[PDB]
């Protein structure tokens with residue numbers, strides 16, 4: 001078995017290997033990458049996502065989210081308070097202000113220490129989940145707005161034609177902005193490209209060990225667990241690496257820099273934070289190997305998780321027994 005310790009693998013495809021996206025995902029899996037839950041892909045030196053980032057400041061962040069924490073430093077939840085709209089240029093200035101800017105630090109490890117020590121005492125503002133793309137239309141390789149759609153994959157594998165579309169999302173981050181422990185909707189893959197700015201640190205649990213994380217989460221968030229049998233679908237809970245180590249939960253960590261891709265694999269729990277002002281783009285995708293994960297994915301039916309239009313068909317076709325309860329949660 002390849003990669004039996006479930007380490008995060010880093011890949012350096014050549015320009016020729018960068019042509020066929022599906023084939024390269026399948027290559028990475030042949031080497032065991034999926035066992036970690038997360039892989040890094042460094043594009044060939046010949047590649048670029050677009051010519052410059054000099055003209056992005058007029059993009060609108062219609063609903064910036066202030067991420068307010070409750071709990072203790074290593075075990076907390078966050079809620080998202082909606083703020084007034086602002087442009088990317090306005091947001092960048094805010095991120096660079098004395099109130100929100102990254103503190104002086106020695107290296108990534110020192111900054112990680114400061115994050116876990118101090119995150120709860122601040123409420124950074126995240127421009128998340130903004131439909132759109134920063135890839136040039138002429139970029140033909142690993143262009144996250146030109147991938148094969150998950151609807152087409154389901155149709156190719158299973159023969160059923162379904163409604164729905166699949167488009168990318170932009171994320172504008174600042175110091176301490178946080179993504180809570182989650183897997184993707186319907187335990188899909190994700191791909192994330194860091195277009196510009198400061199790094200993003202990731203933490204990930206191997207898919208084969210995801211239920212260990214879930215069991216710890218039910219212990220650590222006992223009221224939430226009683227409210228919903230899939231409350232990590234709410235995307236609000238954080239658990240530090242120190243706490244994970246104290247409870248014997250297998251995980252790995254890595255820092256993504258500008259110009260790098262990350263791929264999350266089906267049922268790979270992940271969480272993380274941004275180091276400073278940055279912009280990422282991400283999208284869900286599927287492969288043939290996903291179908292069995294989609295069929296077994298947990299679902300939130302309590303009403304909190306509320307998701308896209310396009311998840312309806314996935315639940316309806318892959319999980320018909322769960323469909324009626326899940327849809328009641330949607331309504």
Ligand SMILES: O=C(O)CNC(=O)C(=O)O
Nearest residue numbers: 171179190191192280282
């Ligand atoms: O970058 C973020 O804030 C969160 N991204 C993801 O969870 C992802 O790409 O799957």
Ligand SMILES: [Mg+2]
Nearest residue numbers: 056057058059
């Ligand atoms: Mg602009």
Ligand code: NI
Nearest residue numbers: 183184190264
């Ligand atoms: Ni994700």
Ligand SMILES: [Zn+2]
Nearest residue numbers: 228300302304
């Ligand atoms: Zn729920």
